[PDB]
Design a binder for this molecule. Structure first.
Ligand SMILES: NC(=[NH2+])c1ccc2[nH]c(-c3cccc(-c4ccccc4)c3[O-])cc2c1
Ligand SMILES: [Ca+2]
Ligand SMILES: [Cl-]
Length: 223
């Protein structure tokens, strides 16, 4: 997260770190046995780490659970990143409490202007790599479809939305992919891609979760 602030330990209880010996992506806990992340974060050997703040220190509240299966959306396109969503089923359910909680899926899509919270352990520099130990947060608004399409002509599908600041300075970045974009208590997006990080007129692009709720529900109900 570039231009954000330190969240404060366990203030984002639905945030998870996907780990394979190092942190490579974020994700969101939506119930006690399922996590939603981005399809491009898929790999084998995933350990899901819940209740984290400093990802390099066991401070207490952590729960490390292996993924039993990861379900990449069947129409995921790795060239356009269209349908960049994945569901991960945990080997055992997690113990929910005030430090580990799930986030609700939305019933409707959000409108431009909506203020959301984006978080993660990704790079905090736009020009260079500085990875934090604790979780960073950024409050950012959803942009209108026209500004998004004018920024990325021909690359935005109906399953994506832009959020951020066109003046540059604040954005999600590498290491944040797969994580949450929460607006009014509902998970509206998943960190997907962007051109550089925090560059002028190149906002972050997110997977539009409201378009996949029936798919998430039906898939979880059958697995
Ligand atoms: N400007 C943004 N808003 C933004 C958001 C998420 C991002 N993720 C990345 C990213 C960069 C290199 C590798 C990965 C990656 C690749 C495979 C698996 C996991 C992460 C990224 O997600 C860049 C990147 C940029
Ligand atoms: Ca820790
Ligand atoms: Cl277009």
């Amino acid at each position: 997260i570039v231009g954000g602030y330190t969240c404060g330990a366990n203030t984002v209880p639905y945030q998870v770190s996907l780990n394979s010996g190092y942190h490579f992506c974020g994700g969101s806990l939506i119930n006690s046995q399922w996590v939603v992340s981005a399809a491009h974060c898929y790999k084998s050997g995933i350990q899901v780490r819940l209740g984290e703040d400093n990802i390099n220190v066991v401070e207490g509240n952590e729960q490390f659970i292996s993924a039993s299966k990861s379900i990449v959306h069947p129409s995921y396109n790795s060239n356009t990143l269209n349908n960049d969503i994945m569901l991960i089923k945990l080997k055992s359910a997690a113990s929910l409490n005030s430090r580990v909680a799930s986030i609700s899926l939305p019933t409707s899509c959000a409108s431009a202007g909506t203020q959301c919270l984006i978080s993660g352990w990704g790079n905090t520099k736009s020009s260079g790599t500085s990875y934090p130990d604790v979780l960073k947060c950024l409050k950012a608004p959803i942009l209108s479809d026209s500004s998004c399409k004018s920024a990325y002509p021909g690359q935005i599908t109906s399953n994506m939305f832009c959020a951020g600041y066109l003046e540059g300075g604040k954005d999600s970045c590498q290491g944040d992919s797969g994580g949450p974009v929460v607006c009014s208590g509902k998970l509206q997006g998943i960190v997907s891609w962007g051109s550089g990080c925090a560059q002028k007129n190149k906002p972050g692009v997110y997977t539009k979760v409201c378009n996949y709720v029936s798919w998430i529900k039906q898939t979880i109900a059958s697995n």
